[PDB]
Structure formats: structure tokens, C-alpha cells
Amino acid sequence: AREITDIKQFLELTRRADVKTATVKINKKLNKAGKPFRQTKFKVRGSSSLYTLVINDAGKAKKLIQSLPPTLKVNRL
Amino acid sequence: GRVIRNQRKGAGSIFTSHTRLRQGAAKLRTLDYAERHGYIRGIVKQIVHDSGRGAPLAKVVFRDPYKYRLREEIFIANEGVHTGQFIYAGKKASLNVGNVLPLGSVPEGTIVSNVEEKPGDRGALARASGNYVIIIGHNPDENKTRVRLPSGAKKVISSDARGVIGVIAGGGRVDKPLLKAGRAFHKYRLKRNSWPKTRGVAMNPVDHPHGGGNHQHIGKASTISRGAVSGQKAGLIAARRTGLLRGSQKT
Amino acid sequence: RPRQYATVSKTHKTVSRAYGGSRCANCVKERIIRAFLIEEQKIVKKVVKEQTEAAK
Amino acid sequence: SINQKLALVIKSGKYTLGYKSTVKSLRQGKSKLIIIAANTPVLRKSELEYYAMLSKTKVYYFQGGNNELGTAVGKLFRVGVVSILEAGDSDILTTL
Amino acid sequence: AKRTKKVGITGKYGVRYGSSLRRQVKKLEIQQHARYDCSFCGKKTVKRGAAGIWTCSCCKKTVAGGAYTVSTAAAATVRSTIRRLREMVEA
Amino acid sequence: AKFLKAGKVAVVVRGRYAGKKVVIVKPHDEGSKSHPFGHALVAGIERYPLKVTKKHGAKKVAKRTKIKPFIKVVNYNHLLPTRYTLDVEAFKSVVSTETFEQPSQREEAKKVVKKAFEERHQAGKNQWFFSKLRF
RNA sequence: GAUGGGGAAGCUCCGUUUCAAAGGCCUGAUUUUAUGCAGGCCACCAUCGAAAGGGAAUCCGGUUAAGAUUCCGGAACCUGGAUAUGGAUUCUUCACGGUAACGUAACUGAAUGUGGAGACGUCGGCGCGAGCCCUGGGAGGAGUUAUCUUUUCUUCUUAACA
RNA sequence: CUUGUGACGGCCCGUGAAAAUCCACAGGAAGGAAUAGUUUUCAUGCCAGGUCGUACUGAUAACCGCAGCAGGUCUCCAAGG
RNA sequence: AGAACUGGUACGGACAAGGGGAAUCUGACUGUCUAAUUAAAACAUAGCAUUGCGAUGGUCAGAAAGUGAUGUUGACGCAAU
RNA sequence: UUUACUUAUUCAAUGAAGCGGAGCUGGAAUUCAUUUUCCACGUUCUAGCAUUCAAGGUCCCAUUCGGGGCUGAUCCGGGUU
Ligand SMILES: [Zn+2]
Ligand SMILES: [Zn+2]
């Protein structure tokens, strides 16, 4: 249950090799009145802790899922 | 009749002294080698109230010369000692406060406290608040020292018998009143179950040798022979005179 | 609490100095000074004793 | 007497009180003399003795207390130590 | 303002216990609650903790002494005569 | 008379190197700009060399006569001086303020003092300095 | 309250570290092997005794006819023991920065010793915090409404742990 | 309001438990490198965590008072006017 | 805190919530007791006074005992009145 | 009646540590011949620290990684005091 910001850290985490499960949450959010944005939350699950890579850019989000491995069992929600 | 109060205090179920809040005994270090061939240094590290006593104590620290450790002792504090203090104890020590010079070494007119009665009892005489022992004279050939005890008593004791220099602390204590059964309550409840004292002449004759009668009166005289027994020794025991004394202790 | 002291690492338990997590730093100062001073005093006492009793 | 000479120095010469400024002056060598109160810590006392040994400055021990020395210099607080840098008028440096 | 003519600290004891005992207690309560001077630092930070425990807050020291005063006169005499005979013996 | 002269022996009381014996080589008695107070550059020991006997044959001997020295800027108030002295030729050049603020310069300064300390200790000299202050 | 010991016709009494030969470790040497065995250390001196004293470690949500911090889901913590990768240190072998207070991801340390926490009264008022209570706006729902009431009530939450 | 704590203050002829457990420090035995090792008080990863209790009442009806007795029986939470 | 205006002079509007004074006897006080007929003037209390005791001891206990309470104590103390 | 001996008995300590004697090494002693005996026979401005069969010196060993004995710390008697 630890925040994460470094993306390559998150990637080597996905390949920590105890990691098996992952999740991607979408959230409807507000920066300002007229641009209620879309917060992405990559929650990866291994053994001792859950790591939450936070993101507030859909372009980066898509790129991330394009970068991820296929075998890591994901949950989109 | 019936068993009576002192005659139960011997058995001592509820009359045992209370001990939870005491630091153990206060005693003089063993007369091992140094205190009978030289001296040793110790550090008064702290001073502390002991509960049930009236004087304070001194947590003092020496070093066992035979082993790498620090052996702690509990002394009685005389007036003039303080923390972080160097207390030199033994035969070849110095005549200041706190030191433990032998009575054979000290001179006449000297003041001491926590004095031994025979070398290796480690503190018998004048251990209570403000009580001191005075030296009188020696007979070094057949080494003996005459000392005057707070009862005025001229005793003779050995010369290797140690004794701390100074006057015991906490003096003046009984110069103050108490004013309050509660103050006395607290006193005797940390000492031992010894209070309140109730009068036999108010008891019944089963419960005491004064009790009873349509008038609170003793009836039979309270001056009791020393060769009386356990059950009769209520009153003034082995007494030589009674009443108000007017004059002098005469000693 | 003590078992939690046993959990944590050294950084959280003491200080990088001699007498890290035992004695106040000012007390460290004081006792260092005491050591140096009185051993020097011991030395000068020793040599004055030696020379006066050598004369005598 | 000594308190009179010290007041003369307070008026004419110059000085600094207290351990910190005193030992700073002594490190700089600018001082000449120290007066030290009896009551102040034996450690501080011996340390100053060492410092003045190095500096070759003079030392004097005051038959009094931080209060007495303060009254002597004319101040109203505790002074365990005083450093005479120069007197000008007094025989302090000459006597004792 | 000025509160009490002559009871002082013994007005908390009220109308009890007799004037004489209140006088004695007054004397000794003053003695025991007063601040004294630590000989080591000259400061007025000396107080009783307990009977014959007289401690100084400023200089973090403790001295043993009388329950109500910090130096009892008997022990003063003892200090003096000890110094006397000790000077004589070393002499 | 000032005595904070650049060959001196002193006793560090405050800091990671406290209770230590350093040698004074470069006193900035009249202040500075970056450490503006009565301060110095000094050097001393971080790990004293151990006692040595006849029993040791050469390996424990080398291991025990090793040194871990250090250098340090410090306040005189955070120093204690002595009367002892020491020779300062081998490193009074390399040591400077510019030797600091560059860890490459630091390590090089540490290399030479070790050599400069080991031989003066390997010679039975300055025993008081190469000893330990116990407390 | 055993044992050792002493009493007692004796059932049993005293006494709890004492007039006791009161034991069990670390190290390596045997790598036929036991643990004999080279070595040194140390010195409780049984035990029992508090479901309110001390004490290693868990929380939320939901769930049953009846259970729940115990079950389910999720997220955590300690203890013990194997333990491998990464990282730090080092050819100046057991880290560096800081004037200092001290800081950091770590960053050798046996015997023995020292210190600290555990571990500590009661009362007063003062400050600070938590939850509650009072309350404004706005978003939903309900009520009243002959009259008047931008109205009365109600939901707007966020645990351990990091 | 209830509570928890922090620093202070007052009182005492009263100064207001112990032990287990844990940690650090001093010390420097022992051992350790260069193609190497070093450490498992840094991160991460692996396994296991037994035994017994656990429902309910806790009282003008579940307890004791011969009983579904106006009695007695330790405590926590505690809204608005 | 104060002022206008008002009221069938009512208004701490219910609840809540001191009767007092002058003297006597007696115990000083607070406190405790005869559970289930006596709460008092009784006991206690602080304070006053006396007595014993220097540890090979005083007081008390125990069938005894290498036993024990005061005593982890020491005449400003323990014990008995 | 006075005192003597320690072993019996009794008391108390202590982790049964420094007993006693003699002796060095110094001071005094007047030595009336050589010492006659007596004193010491490692510590005191300071709230530090003191430990690894002790370092050293010395003699051996099988030198090598090191190992051991004497002294450092006088000797005798084994009466714990
Ligand atoms: Zn401190
Ligand atoms: Zn003071």
C-alpha cells in the first residue's frame, strides 16, 4: 500500500517475479470546473505489499498499458 | 480470659513491617581487606527518600577490586554530603564527613554515626534522624573505645568497629507537630500496623487487665514486675519511679 | 516500545557519536574534559612526587 | 584593597567576564590575568588553569563567590570568572 | 492586599488544632517551603523534595539535611569542630 | 600568548569524531567566510591502532597498526587544545580549504596522512597521541 | 511452597538461599566418534502466584435463524527459521555529510560491564488534539402548508497500516 | 461536554510496585578483501505459527437470597432544552 | 451594566430549593462502633506525660527447632501504659 | 576469688580473598657493635576510565600461524576471618 511515481521502478516491479496480479482503476476527477479529468491508478499486487502507481494523463496511461507484459493478470475497472 | 494485643503482635500476621517502598537495608560495606589495610573511594551517585524511615539514604557506588564490576551500596546520609561526592572509606582515610574511619583511628570529641557494635554487623548505632554518637576515650592496648550514646549511655566497643562521620540527617523532624490523625495514619501505615492505640481500661476485662468496671479505673497498680509473664505485662514494666520527673536524668 | 526498538534499524536507535544513545552529548563533553584534565594532573603530580622524593 | 583595585580597572582598564568570552580572549592571547571565584566548578577551574598554563597568563583565586566578585566589579549578577586584558592605572598585574 | 495578621500559611488549617501548635507549624512550614542558596552556584534554586533531601534545580544537585531547614546548627558545629580537629591532626 | 599554532595536538569533544585526538595544521583564528568563526583545518584518527605484543607474528601486527584517519573543519569552542606538539611537513601543503568541497581531494589527503601517521607511530614516538582517550 | 538441612512418638513443623560437592555455556579440537577432548567464561540457586498490574503482532466492509476483531473479500503486522537477488562498504579493509546540535536505506563487533525504556502518586488550572454538540452554504429525500415558515427532520463517512 | 496528552504549579514526619522482555553504549576477542569477499539491524522474496475459552443473561425473570423475592451484586459509553 | 414601553404588583411564577436568635450541660474538631432495638457525652484523634530496652538486648510468638514478629529496624527508635 | 590455653560449646560475617609469621625497601631509633626495637612497606582539588590467564622483561619450544614456564605480584605454614 505504497505510492509510486517512478515508472521504470513500477516496470521492474511488474517484473519483480513475485508479482502476479495488477489492476487499473479509472476515476472521474476535478482539476477545475470545466476540465474534470480522468485519474488512472495502476495497483500492482505481489506478496507483501500493494504498489499504487498514480497517473493523471490518459496518454501516459495508454502508453503504460501498451508497455506492460501480457502475462501479468490484469483487472480493468 | 483472652489473648491480648502484644501477645498477638509476636505472631505477626498483620503486624509485619511494610517493605514495598524500601530500597533494602542500609549497611556498611564489608570489612574485607582495604578498609582494614587502607581505604577506598566511592561516589555518592544519588540521595533518595526511603519510605518508613525518617532519614534519607545515599546510593553510593564502589568498585569491587577483585572483579570488573560496580558494587552499589545504600548508606544513611549525614548532613553535609551531596551528590557526585567522593566518599573515602577505610583505615587510612581522612577525617571529613561521609568517611568511615575506625573508632580506633578517630580522636576524642569526635562525632560519628551508623556506628558498628562489633566489626562486621555493618551499622547498628545511631542510624535514625539527627542522632549522633560521641567519642570519649580509648584503651588502645586492649583496643577499646568509650562512646556516649543518645540515651546518655557510656558504652565500650572495639576499635576496628567502623562508623560514619557526621550527624545523621533529617533532624528536627519531631520538632514539628502532626495535628492530624491522618498524618499519623500515613506515618504508621508505611511503617507497620501500630495505630490507633486503644485503651485497655476502656476494653473489657477479658480483653485486657485494666478493662471493665462501672467506672474507667485500673484498680490494680500498673507497675509490673520484670519477672511477670506474657499476658500480665500491660503497663509500666520494671519501673523504678513514676509520675512527673522534676530535675535531671542524673548521669 | 522495546520490542519495536528491536524491529527498527540502528539509525533510529542511537547517534553517530561515541556514546550515541546512552549519554547526553554535553555529558560526553564534560567527561572527556574530566579525563584529559585529571590524567594530565596525575602525570604532573607523579613527576613532582618523584623528583622531590629523589632529592629526599 | 583588591575590590578597590578591581573597580579602578573597571574604570580605566578593560576586561571581559564569563567563561566563553574569557577563554576566547585567552585563545587569542590578548588577556593578561584571570580572577576565578571559588564556588565555580572544579572542572572549569582546572580547564582554565590549563589554558592559562599554555598562554602563560596569570591566575588569581578569589576568596568569595560569583555574587561577591560581581559586587566587586560593580555588576549585579553572577561572575565565576573575569579576564583582565589591561589595567592601565592599577597595580593588579604587579601585586600578587 | 494584606490578607492575614498572624496566621500566614496556617490559615489553610483554619480554626483547628490550637493556636500554639499552629504557631510551631507556621515557623517550620516557612522554614521548609522557603528557597535557599545552593552553595555551589549561589543561586536561589534550593528546595526540599523530602525530609532532609534538599535539591537545587539550577545546578542539579542534592544535599542531605534537616527535614525543615537545609543546614541545622548542630551539624554546623560538627562541621566546624571536624575541621578543627582535622587541621590539628594533619598539623 | 596565543597557542593555536599549526603543529599542535588537540582533543575533539563535539561531533562524530568526539573524544578524539587531532593535530592542528591550519588555524583560521580570525574567522573566515564559509565557517565564519574561530576555526581550523585539523586531522586525526577515526580508528586507533590497537595494542601490540610479542605474541603477534606480523599479520595481526600489520592489521592492528593500521589507521583510519580523518580531516575536519571545526570551531575552537568545539576543540580542546593540549600542550603536546607534532611534526607537520608531510601534509600542511596538501591540506587546505580547497582540499575540502571535493571528495576526491579529501580521499587523497586521507591517503598521505595515513602514511604520515603510520611511520611516526611505527616509530615509538608520540605514544600519547597515538594512544586512546578512555572515558 | 518443595529440595538441602534441622525438629518431631508421629500425621508432619520450620525455613526459601539457607552451615549443600546444589550447575549449564560458548569456543573450537574428534571430521574412525562421540561428544570423550583440547580451552576459558560464568555463577538463578526450584516452583506456584494477577483472564483489572507488566506484556511482540490486525484493521475495514459484508455475512448467519443463532457465530464473529475468530467466518468471506481486501489490505496489514509480529515472531521463529531457512534464506537468494539487488543495494551499501572495502585494495586506506569494517560508510559518508555537517562548525555543532545531528542526518542517512544500510554501513563488523564475542567475553564482560554500564545505562535507559518496562516503571508508575494525587489535585488545580493552562494550552493542544480526538470524537460529540452548535452552525452556514450547496446537492438529494421526507414532512407541514386555512395562514406564515428562502421552512422542521434527515444522508454528505473514510479504519488498521505505509 | 466526555476524554487523551504536554509543560508547569501545590501537598507530604506519606515522595506515590516488581520482574520478565528489549535496546543502546564502553570494550575490542575473532574474522574479513580484489576478483575478491564482507555484512541478513537496508529493501525484496520463501515456509510455519500449535493448545484451551469464544453462544447468551449480567438482572423489578437468566447470579445469591428456599422463588419468575420492591433486597443485594464490580465496570465502560452517555445526545437536545 | 443601564434606560424606555408593558402587565388585573405579576416575575427564583412549575421543578428545584437555609428557619433563626440568646444561653446552659457535655465532647475539642474531621473521623469510627454495638450488621438485625442504643450513632451517644462512648472509642479514636492530634498533643501532654510516664515506663522498659544499647542487640549477648526490650516486648511478643512457637510442641520444639540451625525457628520466628518488631527488624530491609537501632533511643528524634521499637515496645507497654 | 583472679586470670591464663584452644578444640569442646556458643555468635556473626563471607561468593569462605590477602590470616599469621618471617622478610626485603625506606624513615626513626642509639645503634655501644650490628642493628637494639618502632613506623610505613604503590591511591584524596574534579560525578571520567579502569576487564580478556597483564603489558613488559626473561628462559624454553620447533618458529609459523605461534605455544609454554619464572618474574612482573617476596617466602613458609594450608587454622577462611
Ligand atoms: Zn546527559
Ligand atoms: Zn545549586
Curated annotation (Swiss-Prot), chain B:
Q: Superkingdom, according to UniProt?
A: Eukaryota
Q: Which Pfam families match?
A: Ribosomal_L2, Ribosomal_L2_C
Which keywords, in A-to-Z order, does the entry hold? Cytoplasm, Isopeptide bond, Phosphoprotein, Ribonucleoprotein, Ribosomal protein, RNA-binding, rRNA-binding, Ubl conjugation
Position(s) of the covalent cross-link Glycyl lysine isopeptide (Lys-Gly) (interchain with G-Cter in ubiquitin)?
A: 45, 92, 118, 144
UniProt signal peptide: none
Gene Ontology CC terms, in alphabetical order: cytosol; cytosolic large ribosomal subunit
Protein's GO biological process: cytoplasmic translation; maintenance of translational fidelity; ribosomal large subunit biogenesis
Cell compartment(s), UniProt: Cytoplasm
Chief location? cytoplasm
Return one GO MF term: rRNA binding
Q: Which residues carry this modification: Phosphoserine?
A: 51, 94, 158-159, 248
Check the record and name the InterPro entries matching this protein: NA-bd_OB-fold, Rib_uL2_dom2, Ribosomal_uL2, Ribosomal_uL2_C, Ribosomal_uL2_CS, Ribosomal_uL2_dom3, Ribosomal_uL2_RNA-bd_dom, Translation_prot_SH3-like_sf
- Relate the protein's function as given in its record: Component of the ribosome, a large ribonucleoprotein complex responsible for the synthesis of proteins in the cell. The small ribosomal subunit (SSU) binds messenger RNAs (mRNAs) and translates the encoded message by selecting cognate aminoacyl-transfer RNA (tRNA) molecules. The large subunit (LSU) contains the ribosomal catalytic site termed the peptidyl transferase center (PTC), which catalyzes the formation of peptide bonds, thereby polymerizing the amino acids delivered by tRNAs into a polypeptide chain.
Entry's family note: Belongs to the universal ribosomal protein uL2 family.
Anything else known = There are 2 genes for uL2 in yeast.
**What protein name applies here?**
Large ribosomal subunit protein uL2A
Underlying gene: RPL2A
Curated annotation (Swiss-Prot), chain C:
**Which Gene Ontology MF annotations are present?**
structural constituent of ribosome
Can you cite an annotated GO cellular component? preribosome, large subunit precursor
Provide the primary localization.
cytoplasm
Compartments, as annotated in UniProt? Cytoplasm
Q: Which residues cross the membrane?
A: none
* A biological process from GO: cytoplasmic translation
What's the miscellaneous note? Answer: Present with 23600 molecules/cell in log phase SD medium.
UniProt lists the family membership as follows: Belongs to the eukaryotic ribosomal protein eL34 family.
| Protein name according to UniProt | Large ribosomal subunit protein eL34A
Which gene specifies this protein's sequence? RPL34A
Swiss-Prot record, chain D:
Instruction: Quote the subcellular location field of this record.
Output: Cytoplasm
Q: Enumerate the Gene3D superfamilies for this protein.
A: 3.30.1330.30
GO BP term, example: cytoplasmic translation
**Covalent cross-link site, Glycyl lysine isopeptide (Lys-Gly) (interchain with G-Cter in ubiquitin):** 14, 45, 75
SUPFAM superfamilies named in the record? L30e-like
Chief localization: cytoplasm
Q: Which GO terms describe its cellular component?
A: cytoplasm; cytosol; cytosolic large ribosomal subunit
User: Is Ubl conjugation there in the keyword field?
Assistant: yes
Q: What UniProt keywords are attached to this protein's entry?
A: Cytoplasm, Isopeptide bond, Ribonucleoprotein, Ribosomal protein, Ubl conjugation
What domain of life is recorded for the organism?
Eukaryota
The record's GO molecular-function terms, alphabetically, read: pre-mRNA 5'-splice site binding; RNA binding; structural constituent of ribosome
Query: Further notes on this entry?
Result: Present with 59300 molecules/cell in log phase SD medium.
Family listed: Belongs to the eukaryotic ribosomal protein eL30 family.
How does this protein assemble?
A: Component of the large ribosomal subunit (LSU). Mature yeast ribosomes consist of a small (40S) and a large (60S) subunit. The 40S small subunit contains 1 molecule of ribosomal RNA (18S rRNA) and 33 different proteins (encoded by 57 genes). The large 60S subunit contains 3 rRNA molecules (25S, 5.8S and 5S rRNA) and 46 different proteins (encoded by 81 genes).
Q: Which PANTHER family match?
A: RIBOSOMAL PROTEIN L30
| Designated name of the protein | Large ribosomal subunit protein eL30
Swiss-Prot record, chain E:
- Which chain segments does UniProt annotate as zinc-finger regions (C4-type)? 38-59
Q: Name one Pfam family in it.
A: Ribosomal_L37ae
Q: Where in the cell is it found?
A: Cytoplasm
Going by the UniProt record, its keywords in alphabetical order are: Cytoplasm, Metal-binding, Phosphoprotein, Ribonucleoprotein, Ribosomal protein, Zinc, Zinc-finger
Q: Does the keyword Phosphoprotein apply?
A: yes
**Which BP terms in the Gene Ontology apply to this protein?**
cytoplasmic translation
One GO CC annotation, please? cytosolic large ribosomal subunit
Q: Which residues carry this modification: Phosphoserine?
A: 39
Q: Does the keyword Acetylation apply?
A: no
Q: Name one GO molecular function term.
A: zinc ion binding
Tell me the HAMAP family matching this sequence: Ribosomal_eL43
Q: What else is known?
A: Present with 44600 molecules/cell in log phase SD medium. There are 2 genes for eL43 in yeast.
> Could you say which protein family the record assigns here?
Belongs to the eukaryotic ribosomal protein eL43 family.
Function statement = Component of the ribosome, a large ribonucleoprotein complex responsible for the synthesis of proteins in the cell. The small ribosomal subunit (SSU) binds messenger RNAs (mRNAs) and translates the encoded message by selecting cognate aminoacyl-transfer RNA (tRNA) molecules. The large subunit (LSU) contains the ribosomal catalytic site termed the peptidyl transferase center (PTC), which catalyzes the formation of peptide bonds, thereby polymerizing the amino acids delivered by tRNAs into a polypeptide chain.
Q: Quaternary structure?
A: Component of the large ribosomal subunit (LSU). Mature yeast ribosomes consist of a small (40S) and a large (60S) subunit. The 40S small subunit contains 1 molecule of ribosomal RNA (18S rRNA) and 33 different proteins (encoded by 57 genes). The large 60S subunit contains 3 rRNA molecules (25S, 5.8S and 5S rRNA) and 46 different proteins (encoded by 81 genes).
Q: Gene of origin?
A: RPL43A
